[PDB]
Write a protein that holds these residues in place. Structure first.
Motif, PDB file in Angstrom:
ATOM      1  N   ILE A 164       0.807  -1.219   0.000  1.00  0.00           N
ATOM      2  CA  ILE A 164       0.000   0.000   0.000  1.00  0.00           C
ATOM      3  C   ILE A 164       0.843   1.274   0.000  1.00  0.00           C
ATOM      4  O   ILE A 164       1.631   1.522   0.901  1.00  0.00           O
ATOM      5  N   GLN A 165       0.671   2.095  -1.014  1.00  0.00           N
ATOM      6  CA  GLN A 165       1.485   3.278  -1.071  1.00  0.00           C
ATOM      7  C   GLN A 165       0.859   4.392  -0.238  1.00  0.00           C
ATOM      8  O   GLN A 165       1.557   5.273   0.277  1.00  0.00           O
ATOM      9  N   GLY A 166      -0.454   4.344  -0.072  1.00  0.00           N
ATOM     10  CA  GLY A 166      -1.141   5.458   0.555  1.00  0.00           C
ATOM     11  C   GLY A 166      -2.634   5.309   0.389  1.00  0.00           C
ATOM     12  O   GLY A 166      -3.087   4.383  -0.277  1.00  0.00           O
ATOM     13  N   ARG A 167      -3.400   6.194   1.020  1.00  0.00           N
ATOM     14  CA  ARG A 167      -4.846   6.206   0.855  1.00  0.00           C
ATOM     15  C   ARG A 167      -5.198   7.524   0.217  1.00  0.00           C
ATOM     16  O   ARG A 167      -4.331   8.382   0.049  1.00  0.00           O
ATOM     17  N   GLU A 168      -6.464   7.698  -0.142  1.00  0.00           N
ATOM     18  CA  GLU A 168      -6.866   8.947  -0.764  1.00  0.00           C
ATOM     19  C   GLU A 168      -8.342   8.955  -1.118  1.00  0.00           C
ATOM     20  O   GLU A 168      -8.738   8.671  -2.246  1.00  0.00           O
ATOM     21  N   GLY A 169      -9.158   9.312  -0.147  1.00  0.00           N
ATOM     22  CA  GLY A 169     -10.584   9.234  -0.334  1.00  0.00           C
ATOM     23  C   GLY A 169     -11.026   7.814  -0.048  1.00  0.00           C
ATOM     24  O   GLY A 169     -10.396   7.111   0.765  1.00  0.00           O
ATOM     25  N   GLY A 179       4.366  -3.723 -10.705  1.00  0.00           N
ATOM     26  CA  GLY A 179       4.865  -2.379 -10.530  1.00  0.00           C
ATOM     27  C   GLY A 179       3.801  -1.335 -10.802  1.00  0.00           C
ATOM     28  O   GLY A 179       3.994  -0.143 -10.558  1.00  0.00           O
ATOM     29  N   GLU A 180       2.663  -1.764 -11.302  1.00  0.00           N
ATOM     30  CA  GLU A 180       1.648  -0.793 -11.613  1.00  0.00           C
ATOM     31  C   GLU A 180       1.285   0.008 -10.386  1.00  0.00           C
ATOM     32  O   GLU A 180       1.447  -0.467  -9.271  1.00  0.00           O
ATOM     33  N   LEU A 181       0.780   1.219 -10.593  1.00  0.00           N
ATOM     34  CA  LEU A 181       0.247   2.015  -9.483  1.00  0.00           C
ATOM     35  C   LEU A 181      -1.255   2.327  -9.554  1.00  0.00           C
ATOM     36  O   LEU A 181      -1.707   3.115 -10.391  1.00  0.00           O
ATOM     37  N   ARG A 182      -2.029   1.765  -8.638  1.00  0.00           N
ATOM     38  CA  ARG A 182      -3.473   1.883  -8.765  1.00  0.00           C
ATOM     39  C   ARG A 182      -4.227   2.317  -7.520  1.00  0.00           C
ATOM     40  O   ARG A 182      -3.903   1.909  -6.411  1.00  0.00           O
ATOM     41  N   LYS A 183      -5.245   3.143  -7.716  1.00  0.00           N
ATOM     42  CA  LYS A 183      -6.214   3.384  -6.675  1.00  0.00           C
ATOM     43  C   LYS A 183      -7.223   2.236  -6.703  1.00  0.00           C
ATOM     44  O   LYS A 183      -7.999   2.119  -7.646  1.00  0.00           O
ATOM     45  N   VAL A 184      -7.209   1.378  -5.686  1.00  0.00           N
ATOM     46  CA  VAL A 184      -8.277   0.386  -5.498  1.00  0.00           C
ATOM     47  C   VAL A 184      -9.300   0.876  -4.450  1.00  0.00           C
ATOM     48  O   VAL A 184      -9.058   1.848  -3.692  1.00  0.00           O
ATOM     49  N   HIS A 185     -10.446   0.214  -4.379  1.00  0.00           N
ATOM     50  CA  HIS A 185     -11.429   0.632  -3.392  1.00  0.00           C
ATOM     51  C   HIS A 185     -11.044   0.318  -1.974  1.00  0.00           C
ATOM     52  O   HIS A 185     -10.383  -0.682  -1.716  1.00  0.00           O
ATOM     53  N   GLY A 186     -11.506   1.156  -1.053  1.00  0.00           N
ATOM     54  CA  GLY A 186     -11.221   0.958   0.347  1.00  0.00           C
ATOM     55  C   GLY A 186     -11.825  -0.332   0.848  1.00  0.00           C
ATOM     56  O   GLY A 186     -11.173  -1.103   1.559  1.00  0.00           O
TER      57      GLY A 186
END
Ligand SMILES: [Mg+2]
Ligand SMILES: [Mg+2]
Ligand SMILES: [Mg+2]
Ligand SMILES: [Mg+2]
Ligand SMILES: [Mg+2]
Ligand SMILES: [Mg+2]
Ligand SMILES: [Mg+2]
Ligand SMILES: [Mg+2]
Ligand SMILES: [Mg+2]
Ligand SMILES: [Mg+2]
Ligand SMILES: [Mg+2]
Ligand SMILES: [Mg+2]
Ligand SMILES: [Mg+2]
Ligand SMILES: [Mg+2]
Ligand SMILES: [Mg+2]
Ligand SMILES: [Mg+2]
Ligand SMILES: [Mg+2]
Ligand SMILES: [Mg+2]
Ligand SMILES: [Mg+2]
Ligand SMILES: [Mg+2]
Ligand SMILES: [Mg+2]
Ligand SMILES: [Mg+2]
Ligand SMILES: [Mg+2]
Ligand SMILES: [Mg+2]
Ligand SMILES: [Mg+2]
Ligand SMILES: [Mg+2]
Ligand SMILES: [Mg+2]
Ligand SMILES: [Mg+2]
Ligand SMILES: [Mg+2]
Ligand SMILES: [Mg+2]
Ligand SMILES: [Mg+2]
Ligand SMILES: [Mg+2]
Ligand SMILES: [Mg+2]
Ligand SMILES: [Mg+2]
Ligand SMILES: [Mg+2]
Ligand SMILES: [Mg+2]
Ligand SMILES: [Mg+2]
Ligand SMILES: [Mg+2]
Ligand SMILES: [Mg+2]
Ligand SMILES: [Mg+2]
Ligand SMILES: [Mg+2]
Ligand SMILES: [Mg+2]
Ligand SMILES: [Mg+2]
Ligand SMILES: [Mg+2]
Ligand SMILES: [Mg+2]
Ligand SMILES: [Mg+2]
Ligand SMILES: [Mg+2]
Ligand SMILES: [Mg+2]
Ligand SMILES: [Mg+2]
Ligand SMILES: [Mg+2]
Ligand SMILES: [Mg+2]
Ligand SMILES: [Mg+2]
Ligand SMILES: [Mg+2]
Ligand SMILES: [Mg+2]
Ligand SMILES: [Mg+2]
Ligand SMILES: [Mg+2]
Ligand SMILES: [Mg+2]
Ligand SMILES: [Mg+2]
Ligand SMILES: [Mg+2]
Ligand SMILES: [Mg+2]
Ligand SMILES: [Mg+2]
Ligand SMILES: [Mg+2]
Ligand SMILES: [Mg+2]
Ligand SMILES: [Mg+2]
Ligand SMILES: [Mg+2]
Ligand SMILES: [Mg+2]
Ligand SMILES: [Mg+2]
Ligand SMILES: [Mg+2]
Ligand SMILES: [Mg+2]
Ligand SMILES: [Mg+2]
Ligand SMILES: [Mg+2]
Ligand SMILES: [Mg+2]
Ligand SMILES: [Mg+2]
Ligand SMILES: [Mg+2]
Ligand SMILES: [Mg+2]
Ligand SMILES: [Mg+2]
Ligand SMILES: [Mg+2]
Ligand SMILES: [Mg+2]
Ligand SMILES: [Mg+2]
Ligand SMILES: [Mg+2]
Ligand SMILES: [Mg+2]
Ligand SMILES: [Mg+2]
Ligand SMILES: [Mg+2]
Ligand SMILES: [Mg+2]
Ligand SMILES: [Mg+2]
Ligand SMILES: [Mg+2]
Ligand SMILES: [Mg+2]
Ligand SMILES: [Mg+2]
Ligand SMILES: [Mg+2]
Ligand SMILES: [Mg+2]
Ligand SMILES: [Mg+2]
Ligand SMILES: [Mg+2]
Ligand SMILES: [Mg+2]
Ligand SMILES: [Mg+2]
Ligand SMILES: [Mg+2]
Ligand SMILES: [Mg+2]
Ligand SMILES: [Mg+2]
Ligand SMILES: [Mg+2]
Ligand SMILES: [Mg+2]
Ligand SMILES: [Mg+2]
Ligand SMILES: [Mg+2]
Ligand SMILES: [Mg+2]
Ligand SMILES: [Mg+2]
Ligand SMILES: [Mg+2]
Ligand SMILES: [Mg+2]
Ligand SMILES: [Mg+2]
Ligand SMILES: [Mg+2]
Ligand SMILES: [Mg+2]
Ligand SMILES: [Mg+2]
Ligand SMILES: [Mg+2]
Ligand SMILES: [Mg+2]
Ligand SMILES: [Mg+2]
Ligand SMILES: [Mg+2]
Ligand SMILES: [Mg+2]
Ligand SMILES: [Mg+2]
Ligand SMILES: [Mg+2]
Ligand SMILES: [Mg+2]
Ligand SMILES: [Mg+2]
Ligand SMILES: [Mg+2]
Ligand SMILES: [Mg+2]
Ligand SMILES: [Mg+2]
Ligand SMILES: [Mg+2]
Ligand SMILES: [Mg+2]
Ligand SMILES: [Mg+2]
Ligand SMILES: [Mg+2]
Ligand SMILES: [Mg+2]
Ligand SMILES: [Mg+2]
Ligand SMILES: [Mg+2]
Ligand SMILES: [Mg+2]
Ligand SMILES: [Mg+2]
Ligand SMILES: [Mg+2]
Ligand SMILES: [Mg+2]
Ligand SMILES: [Mg+2]
Ligand SMILES: [Mg+2]
Ligand SMILES: [Mg+2]
Ligand SMILES: [Mg+2]
Ligand SMILES: [Mg+2]
Ligand SMILES: [Mg+2]
Ligand SMILES: [Mg+2]
Ligand SMILES: [Mg+2]
Ligand SMILES: [Mg+2]
Ligand SMILES: [Mg+2]
Ligand SMILES: [Mg+2]
Ligand SMILES: [Mg+2]
Ligand SMILES: [Mg+2]
Ligand SMILES: [Mg+2]
Length: 271
Positions: A164-169, A179-186
RNA sequence: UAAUGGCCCACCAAGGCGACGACGGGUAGCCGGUCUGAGAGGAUGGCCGGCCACAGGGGCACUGAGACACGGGCCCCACUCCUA
RNA sequence: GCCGCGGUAAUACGGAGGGCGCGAGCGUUACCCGGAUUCACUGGGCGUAAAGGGCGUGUAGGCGGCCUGGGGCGUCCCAUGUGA
RNA sequence: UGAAAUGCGCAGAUACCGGGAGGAACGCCGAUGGCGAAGGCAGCCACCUGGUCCACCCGUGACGCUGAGGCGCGAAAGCGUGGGGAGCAAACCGGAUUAGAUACCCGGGUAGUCCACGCCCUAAACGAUGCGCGCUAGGUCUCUGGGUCUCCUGGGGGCCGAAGCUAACGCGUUAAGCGCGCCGCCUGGGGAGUACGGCCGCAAGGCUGAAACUCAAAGGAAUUGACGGGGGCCCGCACAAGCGGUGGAGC
RNA sequence: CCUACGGGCAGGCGCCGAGGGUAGGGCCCGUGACUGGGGCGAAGUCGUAACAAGGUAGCUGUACCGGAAGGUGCGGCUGGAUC
RNA sequence: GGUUAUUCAGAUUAGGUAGUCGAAUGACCUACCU
RNA sequence: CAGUGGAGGCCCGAACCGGUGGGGGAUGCAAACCCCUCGGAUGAGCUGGGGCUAGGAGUGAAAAGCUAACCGAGCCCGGAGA
RNA sequence: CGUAAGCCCAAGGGUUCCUACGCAAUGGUCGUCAGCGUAGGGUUAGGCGGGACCUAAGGUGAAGCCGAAAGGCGUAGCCGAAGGGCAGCCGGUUAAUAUUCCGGCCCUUCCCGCAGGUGCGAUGGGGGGACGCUCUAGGCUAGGGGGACCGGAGCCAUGGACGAGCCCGGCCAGAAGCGCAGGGUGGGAGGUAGGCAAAUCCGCCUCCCAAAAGCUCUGCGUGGUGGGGAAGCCCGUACGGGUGACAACCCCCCGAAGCCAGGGAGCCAAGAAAAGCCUCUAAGCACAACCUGCGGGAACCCGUACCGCAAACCGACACAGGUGGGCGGGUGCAAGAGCACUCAGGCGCGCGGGAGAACCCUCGCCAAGGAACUCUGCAAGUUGGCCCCGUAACUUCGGGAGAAGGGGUGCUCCCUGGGGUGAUGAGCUCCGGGGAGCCGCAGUGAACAGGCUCUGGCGACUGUUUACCAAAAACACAGCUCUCUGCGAACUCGUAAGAGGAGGUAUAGGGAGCGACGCUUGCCCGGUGCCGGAAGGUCAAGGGGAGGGGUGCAAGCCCCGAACCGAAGCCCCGGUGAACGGCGGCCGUAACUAUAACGGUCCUAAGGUAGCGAAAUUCCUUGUCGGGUAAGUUCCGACCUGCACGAAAAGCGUAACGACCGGAGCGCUGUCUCGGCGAGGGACCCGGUGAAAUUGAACUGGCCGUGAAGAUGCGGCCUACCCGUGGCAGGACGAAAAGACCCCGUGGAGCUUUACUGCAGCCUGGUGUUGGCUCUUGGUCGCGCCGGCGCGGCUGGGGGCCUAACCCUCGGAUGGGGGGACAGCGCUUGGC
RNA sequence: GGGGAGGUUUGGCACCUCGAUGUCGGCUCGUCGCAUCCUGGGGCUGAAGAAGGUCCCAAGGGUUGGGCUGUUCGCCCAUUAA
């Protein structure tokens, strides 16, 4: 780490095979609501749709728990690490306190014995799984979901994992095994830590036949065919690709990207 | 056999030797002595005396107190000569 | 023999006179010892001259404190055989 | 940058504020400092662990010193599998300098540097000083420990120096002094750490290690000098400041 | 064949047996197109790497590279010059 | 005036190399070494 | 190190699979056979039965090989008396 | 003949079976015979197989989804078997069927009645069925061997034997029970949130006991009793029946790959389902109904002949081909399903008879020589099993190895070691060791049965391939690199639905190239591809509307149209080499000569690095030198002036491997010098049967001419009685195939591309599906106010948020969650 | 410089043969020509002899075995009367 072989026969001189030390003296798969018939070779018109598959050892399908939120808060004991013939990962037959049994992708570190459980409460200890809004950023986790309440997709390959790189909303950042970077759901569930049997990549089929047991058949170079057959078809004495190297269908394979620009999955990536 | 000995034979046992240099390779007769050196040491074994070994190369036994015998014997090889 | 000598003024080449050494001999070459304390036991070294193992740990081996006593292996002394 | 150019920059760079990722190294403390057998070791935290010094003089009673071979460790570079990859950076590309410049300087850049495991085993691996033990002035500051304590006592780290050694240079209770034990090594320079053979190694290579031939030396330290695109001080129509003149023309 | 009739010699066979033959290894010497470096020798060509801060301090292990000395990287060393 | 190529004539050197530097002509607009 | 153990697209060799070389056959025994020889022979093995994939299509350890005894595009009927 | 050429299954075949009569044709001859013609008979099942059972791939297919129509996909279910489940063994009889008729022994379901027993009950829950490969134990059976022992009719030959002689035969089934050997299985109690809240079942937790038995099942042996039972001899066409015993029916040994079976161990590639069966309960019933015993009753449909490695199947044929499973005896050889001979059983292949020419085929042998043969030792030959001795470079340490090279092998007597069954012993059997001796040319005496070495090339290796001329150096391969792909993945098939990918998730999947392993992979982004680049340039529909037009009396209607806004693409800018690709020329220079480390110079995007090199590349060329040979255009080693190597269309190398291709040597040979003899199957002759291609017609000679230029056929000359048979291949421009070469036809077709033009596909702007709120830049009309502020409709663009369209998903939801006016789809725009 | 013969080379032409006239080398079997390689006969010779040279006449017979290359050819080895 891997079993070597004394060269008492060519091929056998190079062929390594896994050490199933981690496999808890348990040949039999849990016959219960656990195995299941499996078969295939190509598509549902009679036609081949994927080149070069076929043959290779018979297999039993082991049903795997990829939602693991049916049994929220219900614990279970890790009864066994078993061999799955149809994934790189190893599996864990775990017995729930319920008396319910299922299988899970055995992650690295899991000991037969370990308690384990799913749900938001759960301890951030290896094995347990729970939503993402809930794992401490930085944690390496695996067998993730992608859209919520939908079963695990990311990181199920052997010894793979994402951080986990971080959260955001309502969403969290992840770095996929790719290596991909993705926003997944909480609200996406994810079992904790990384995948079992990372030792996998270092096996070496070693002989031709071994690839065959894997059900992969021989695969023939484009170069080798004829114009009717394939864009590298000039054949004419070992010969140079005559053009920018292509698939049997003639789309460039040399580097051309294929991903549909206007995909909505798009504005949720970065890598 | 004059006599001990794996010197030779049959049978059994699994031993014997080795960096304190076995096994191999190279080299060489050894000694009293001789040369040299303050000496310790080094080099050396012609002549003389002792011991050994050999007699074209190799093998052999016979006779005999004694030899496997340079000017004895049998055999093979090399070499010289005679020949009907 | 080495250090070197001879490219106009050579005691270093060749001839001469003369001198030195030794004489039925005098030189050359060869090889051994000496010089060579230059394999060092006698009698050598290693900071920079050639020479301390990159550092440990240990086998064998070598070396080993103070006092009493037994044997006496080295060691020592005497005689005796031997050392032709 | 010596000055530059390549480079980056209106597709908005440099400078500045905020937010994020990632790798590597650990400023000040810091040192003539400490520790380790050596290589070597530096933010802080814990954990596991080796060695070492002092006090008390309680225990065992010569159980020691060394150490061929063996076994382990062994900077950097380099190798294998797999990660990782910010900055730096052989190779490489470009700019410039130059006669040329496969270099020095500049712009860019890959293995590599980092980690895990495995291998390599070399070095100016240097104190160019084998380890142990007893002997033989002191002076000075420094780290660390014990003791009523302007100082005695023990263990390290330095500089100066008794005697003594030494070819000198220098050493000197941290010996290169005086002595004993044991190990390792030397035996003219070149050929050559080469060749062959052996043994290691994935390789690159390492260990062991000659001879033919060939030279009159090769060398250590120190002394005079002369020289330096070494330094310090100083002088001369040497330069500078300044006025004429050749070089041009004719003779 | 001899006999004093018990046996002997001759002869035959077997063992071993010099050597000879065949085959495969090891060690050493000589020799071989060509090739590798090495040593000495005219006043040859090319550069100037080292000795002075040698004109980029030097050396060194390794690594890459380069007509060539050599250059560069990583570490090491003073057996480095200068306030 | 500028650029470039070459050349010998000088110039800087103790000297040589090379270069710088100068001139001519055609085309065109400090470095190394003995 | 010895024992035990019994691995392997391991070795020799029948069945079985196959077609290397030669001869024979060539209005054939045969529209691909015969003999001698040869390759594999626990595997990427051989094989019965039941199924699925087809004409610009399938299938192909790739020869343009195979797809009902001639496949660089099957057979049949049709357009067609091109 | 006898791992078949015998015997039993299955498939396919379809009366070919058995009789009787018969020979026109069929039969390659003959035929009295037949598989042929005519006719009559002949196939019997609760238990064998299949169906009134299960499910597999697959098929079909209510729902549902999709498609112009036809149709496609598809849940439940249904169909689908050499797989699961299920009850018959021995023997007799017919001309022809027989687990089918009969005999004997032994079973299964269904229904009825009853006894006893129990909460009964399923389509639902659970158990089980339920599984791989390789190796393997114990016990047993099939099967086989010996027996001096049991039974038997007989036999004494031809020199011997009246005997431990010879010859024959000494089994088969079988319920209960008993025995031997194995498989399966924990028992009890409490709690329970799970097996889509139905449970006493299963799962899971807690403790107690027994750790094994017990219980359950199976195999074998036994077992009341039923059956069978030889050689030989008389009758006999046929084929059996008697004799033939009142038969005997017993010991010992070998022994499975089969049985116990769901046994055990190891391994990685991780090894069907469903019903039966058991169990749990629900609805429903508890006078039912289940369960166990017994009694009485009931038990259908289809196959059943015969052929079946072939004369009855597939191959036009009584075709030397092809066809799955089981049995497949004895002796000998190390073993065996191999080889030789042979039981049982079955055959002599449906034209014969002679002869003993060439020539052909298959085979044997050969003086001296021994590769001289030849494109090539092609072919043949040599060698050959087992046992012991011994064995090299090199190596990836396994290999190379069966390296190489050797010796032994039979038979007789003697001494003796161990294993197995029995008992430890004898007998039987399995494997040996030591001595003495005998015979022959020769002892794996016959048959099965490697020649060997050395050194190059390519390819790592086992594999794959052009069915029917190519088996290779080609493909494949483990391995390496590049690239795409975040999951409703990329990609592929499909109009779609959908499927494959994958019930997989970047240690994964698709594409591409290279191709074990070792060491390595250099430079050139100018062009091409790909990747990146919110700037700019061009750029379509569309928006816009100054400006112009046609017509009308007009209000109007109608058309043209500038600026300006408008994507992708292209341009432009940069990256990129295991992306397509590329990687120089000329002149001068060193102690003689030569050469050129050095320089100069033109061109370029950059000028080829290592390494290799007259090569699977070298034109000149048989390059030059060395090696090898008497002699070497080949081969090996070198040099390098590389016509025209070169680094993943990889570069160099590499143990091992190879029916690959090259060179050499040893062995051995009829390959050759150089041929000869012999065997057999043909050829020849006699009897039967009796084709074919071809064929203008023929009364069809040589030479030299000639002729459309190669004459039996014209001219001239020469020769020549008529007809055949065995032979040979020079001619009949012999046969065959309307030449494959070549050209031609405004013929065809496969393939290629930066030929042309499309099409799929993919990219793209507008627009429909398409909605809400909000912030801010531009326009727009009215008003308030001196080009600007406030407001609403209209907005156009850009940012954000929303949810309800649309999409995904969630123990079925008028719903929750995720995405979200995007995407997808419709029309349309331009691109590739 | 000139004139010829041959019809074995390389060609030119395109006359028969494209409802087919199979190609190089070898083997086997040859047979012809002579412009003769040998052997026989001769002329000249710068022929002493021996050996040769050149030309004339003469087909009767003969005209080897190997190495290398598919080779023909050619080189080479060992011979030969050749
Ligand atoms: Mg391939
Ligand atoms: Mg194509
Ligand atoms: Mg091509
Ligand atoms: Mg091809
Ligand atoms: Mg080509
Ligand atoms: Mg002895
Ligand atoms: Mg013995
Ligand atoms: Mg001697
Ligand atoms: Mg001697
Ligand atoms: Mg002495
Ligand atoms: Mg001596
Ligand atoms: Mg001596
Ligand atoms: Mg003498
Ligand atoms: Mg003497
Ligand atoms: Mg003698
Ligand atoms: Mg003599
Ligand atoms: Mg003698
Ligand atoms: Mg005598
Ligand atoms: Mg004698
Ligand atoms: Mg004498
Ligand atoms: Mg005489
Ligand atoms: Mg006489
Ligand atoms: Mg003079
Ligand atoms: Mg003088
Ligand atoms: Mg003089
Ligand atoms: Mg003198
Ligand atoms: Mg001396
Ligand atoms: Mg001495
Ligand atoms: Mg000494
Ligand atoms: Mg000394
Ligand atoms: Mg040291
Ligand atoms: Mg004492
Ligand atoms: Mg390192
Ligand atoms: Mg590297
Ligand atoms: Mg130091
Ligand atoms: Mg001092
Ligand atoms: Mg002093
Ligand atoms: Mg001293
Ligand atoms: Mg060394
Ligand atoms: Mg070295
Ligand atoms: Mg050597
Ligand atoms: Mg390497
Ligand atoms: Mg002047
Ligand atoms: Mg007498
Ligand atoms: Mg003897
Ligand atoms: Mg210099
Ligand atoms: Mg410089
Ligand atoms: Mg520098
Ligand atoms: Mg310097
Ligand atoms: Mg220096
Ligand atoms: Mg250091
Ligand atoms: Mg110095
Ligand atoms: Mg220095
Ligand atoms: Mg001029
Ligand atoms: Mg085996
Ligand atoms: Mg095999
Ligand atoms: Mg088979
Ligand atoms: Mg024929
Ligand atoms: Mg078609
Ligand atoms: Mg047809
Ligand atoms: Mg028409
Ligand atoms: Mg068989
Ligand atoms: Mg009929
Ligand atoms: Mg019948
Ligand atoms: Mg008839
Ligand atoms: Mg007939
Ligand atoms: Mg017939
Ligand atoms: Mg009749
Ligand atoms: Mg009749
Ligand atoms: Mg009859
Ligand atoms: Mg019915
Ligand atoms: Mg549906
Ligand atoms: Mg069904
Ligand atoms: Mg049945
Ligand atoms: Mg009643
Ligand atoms: Mg019940
Ligand atoms: Mg039920
Ligand atoms: Mg099964
Ligand atoms: Mg009787
Ligand atoms: Mg008689
Ligand atoms: Mg009989
Ligand atoms: Mg009889
Ligand atoms: Mg028993
Ligand atoms: Mg419950
Ligand atoms: Mg309940
Ligand atoms: Mg109950
Ligand atoms: Mg109950
Ligand atoms: Mg039994
Ligand atoms: Mg019985
Ligand atoms: Mg009975
Ligand atoms: Mg029947
Ligand atoms: Mg047949
Ligand atoms: Mg037929
Ligand atoms: Mg027949
Ligand atoms: Mg059998
Ligand atoms: Mg016949
Ligand atoms: Mg012969
Ligand atoms: Mg002979
Ligand atoms: Mg001949
Ligand atoms: Mg040839
Ligand atoms: Mg052959
Ligand atoms: Mg061999
Ligand atoms: Mg026998
Ligand atoms: Mg064999
Ligand atoms: Mg093969
Ligand atoms: Mg073929
Ligand atoms: Mg799918
Ligand atoms: Mg799908
Ligand atoms: Mg799936
Ligand atoms: Mg997968
Ligand atoms: Mg490598
Ligand atoms: Mg490249
Ligand atoms: Mg702008
Ligand atoms: Mg207007
Ligand atoms: Mg008008
Ligand atoms: Mg506008
Ligand atoms: Mg645009
Ligand atoms: Mg490259
Ligand atoms: Mg190009
Ligand atoms: Mg010039
Ligand atoms: Mg050539
Ligand atoms: Mg050539
Ligand atoms: Mg030649
Ligand atoms: Mg060239
Ligand atoms: Mg390439
Ligand atoms: Mg390439
Ligand atoms: Mg093979
Ligand atoms: Mg035609
Ligand atoms: Mg035309
Ligand atoms: Mg045309
Ligand atoms: Mg607005
Ligand atoms: Mg908009
Ligand atoms: Mg939103
Ligand atoms: Mg929603
Ligand atoms: Mg939402
Ligand atoms: Mg509703
Ligand atoms: Mg949202
Ligand atoms: Mg014709
Ligand atoms: Mg014809
Ligand atoms: Mg032709
Ligand atoms: Mg004459
Ligand atoms: Mg004459
Ligand atoms: Mg005439
Ligand atoms: Mg004539
Ligand atoms: Mg004639
Ligand atoms: Mg030629």
């Amino acid at each position: 780490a891997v079993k070597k072989f004394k060269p008492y026969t060519p091929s056998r001189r190079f062929m390594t095979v896994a050490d199933f030390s981690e496999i808890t003296k348990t040949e039999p798969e849990k016959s219960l609501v656990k195995p299941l018939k499996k078969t295939g070779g190509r598509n549902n018109q009679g036609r081949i749709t994927v080149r070069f598959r076929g043959g290779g050892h018979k297999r039993l399908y082991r049903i795997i728990d990829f939602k693991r939120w049916d049994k929220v808060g219900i614990p279970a004991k890790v009864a066994a690490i078993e061999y799955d013939p149809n994934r790189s990962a190893r599996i864990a037959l775990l017995h729930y306190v319920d008396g319910e049994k299922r299988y899970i992708i055995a992650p690295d570190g899991l000991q037969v014995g370990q308690q384990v459980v799913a749900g938001p409460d759960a301890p951030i200890q290896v094995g347990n799984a729970l939503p993402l809004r809930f794992i401490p950023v930085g944690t390496v986790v695996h067998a993730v979901e992608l859209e919520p309440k939908k079963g695990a997709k990311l990181a199920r390959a052997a010894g793979t994992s994402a951080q986990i790189q971080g959260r955001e909303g309502d969403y969290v950042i992840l770095r996929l095994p790719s290596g991909e970077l993705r926003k997944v759901h909480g609200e996406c569930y994810a079992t904790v830590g990384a995948v079992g049997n990372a030792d996998h990549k270092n096996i070496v089929l070693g002989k031709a036949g071994r690839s065959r047991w894997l059900g992969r058949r021989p695969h023939v170079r484009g170069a080798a065919m004829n114009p009717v057959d394939h864009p590298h078809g000039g054949g004419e004495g070992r010969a140079p690709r005559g053009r920018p190297p292509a698939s049997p269908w003639g789309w460039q394979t040399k580097g051309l990207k294929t991903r549909k620009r206007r995909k909505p999955s798009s504005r949720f990536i970065i890598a």
